[PDB]
Ligand SMILES: CCCCSC[C@H]1CN(Cc2c[nH]c3c(N)ncnc23)C[C@@H]1O
């Protein structure tokens with residue numbers, strides 16, 4: 372088997388996995404809790420990072436560098452941009468950008484800084500494994516572009532703008548950051564999100580209503596990938 | 601002696617130190633280069649992270665966790681908010697916030713997410729050491745609050761707004777993120793910035809003109825702290 376990191380942002384995104392696993396140990400590190408469990412020949416390390424790009428960047432780095440994760444699967448929820456996405460639908464990111472990284476005053480495109488690309492890619496083999504698991508268990512799974520930034524998006528103008536600029540199918544606050552860390556540290560990354568809202572007016576209310584259930588959909592799916600890994 | 605990390609965002613913020621040290625080794629890690637040099641009884645690790653919160657978060661984490669840094673000094677430039685600051689003036693951060701971490705749609709204050717504080721603090725002993733080095737070498741040194749985010753600020757309205765909300769004396773794109781990592785990993789952190797611009801209209805032009813020189817002012821100062829450490 373192998374060491375696998377499973378990461379969400381919030382307790383709701385990781386608690387369903389801890390309940391399924393039953394037996395696990397906990398370790399305080401980096402002002403957070405990291406959870407350790409065996410599963411089908413694999414050694415799992417799980418955590419919720421707390422919200423946003425910095426927190427998620429630190430959790431990814433800790434899980435790989437201190438705890439030796441060889442693969443990282445991200446599971447959580449997201450705001451839908453693509454009108455064909457409904458609440459509860461699963462989307463995996465083929466590539467991701469930071470919509471709020473902005474040095475456009477120097478004539479560079481939005482999302483770009485020197486040394487880096489605008490879009491960071493996820494691992495192709497993990498994405499194909501996800502497609503087989505989706506086919507095998509008759510689950511609907513969509514591929515797409517996720518736009519990451521440190522704002523909860525609940526505004527039609529902002530939604531439209533980010534979608535237009537990056538051709539994004541959903542938005543969230545941890546994806547591109549986690550993907551960047553994994554790529555830099557040479558670890559295969561997979562980013563999965565279940566929609567909790569549509570990122571327009573009253574998205575905050577839809578988020579509160581659907582987060583728990585959508586988080587379970589995503590959570591279940593990444594554990595099914597661990598079976599096939 | 602001890603292991604010391606010295607971190608900037610850009611090549612201009614770290615190159616002056618590499619030229620002063622002359623002899624050093626390099627290691628390619630995390631899609632970046634980390635530099636190693638002996639200095640007095642100390643072991644130094646230096647790098648420029650590339651611009652922004654995610655990149656700086658990763659460099660801080662790598663330098664502490666993989667390379668064993670016991671202290672981290674950040675050196676670079678910043679945009680001035682406090683009208684008493686002129687270009688080239690030195691400011692160290694007593695505390696820092698992320699002005700662009702925004703879940704205010706859920707009724708929390710700007711800069712806050714659950715599990716974390718709005719402001720992260722720097723190490724008091726390093727700050728007092730900086731004050732003695734400032735007195736000893738007749739250099740003017742100011743204490744203050746830095747607001748961090750992933751935008752280059754070059755707008756008077758935005759400048760005023762961020763200053764009003766956080767009582768910030770300067771803005772930049774890496775401080776709060778580096779300080780958070782160090783606090784979470786229990787490493788003393790010190791954040792020093794020399795002003796390259798005033799963060800209003802045509803700040804981009806002042807930045808290009810003064811970055812190289814202001815970076816040297818900050819760079820020199822953190823090496824003088826290494827003498828006294
Ligand atoms: C006090 C509660 C604050 C919750 S902030 C939103 C959570 C859920 N995550 C994903 C997420 C779903 N929908 C979104 C939207 N519309 N905008 C931005 N992020 C999202 C990001 C972050 O971990």
Ligand SMILES: CCCCSC[C@H]1CN(Cc2c[nH]c3c(N)ncnc23)C[C@@H]1O
Pocket residue numbers: 474477609610651652676677678679680751752753754771772773774796797798799800803807
């Ligand atoms: C292609 C050139 C891109 C340069 S982007 C600015 C650099 C210098 N750093 C500090 C910095 C000084 N002045 C600032 C301002 N007005 N706004 C925000 N950050 C700052 C942050 C980032 O590493």
